[PDB]
Amino acid sequence: GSSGSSGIRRPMNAFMVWAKDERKRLAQQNPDLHNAELSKMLGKSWKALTLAEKRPFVEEAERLRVQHMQDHPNYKSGPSSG
Structure with a gap:
């Protein structure tokens, strides 16, 4: 139940x-x-973790962040062209 x-x-x-x-x-x-x-505890345990450990938590947070941007392009826009 969602309360x-x-x-x-x-x-x-x-x-x-x-x-x-x-x-x-x-x-x-x-x-x-x-x-x-x-x-204070979440950090000591985090920094301790290794890349492979942050791999699953790194490929996830990256998706959540990019989203918050989709709502507003006020993040970064301007590709390259000749």
């Missing part, structure tokens, strides 16, 4: 994504701690 907000508002990066799952563990582990506090 609350739905759909994503802003895009996420490789770190954010991979965290989306990790953070959850932090929230339950620290019901008194907040994001700012959780991150």
Whole structure:
């Protein structure tokens, strides 16, 4: 059941994504701690990960970002021509 907000508002990066799952563990582990506090852990665990580990979280966040742009071309436009 969906009781609350739905759909994503802003895009996420490789770190954010991979965290989306990790953070959850932090929230339950620290019901008194907040994001700012959780991150501290989401980072140490992230930077530690390797390329192959970020591969699955890197090819995903890249798709979410490009999207937020589709809504508005105010990101980057201007190909090459002779």
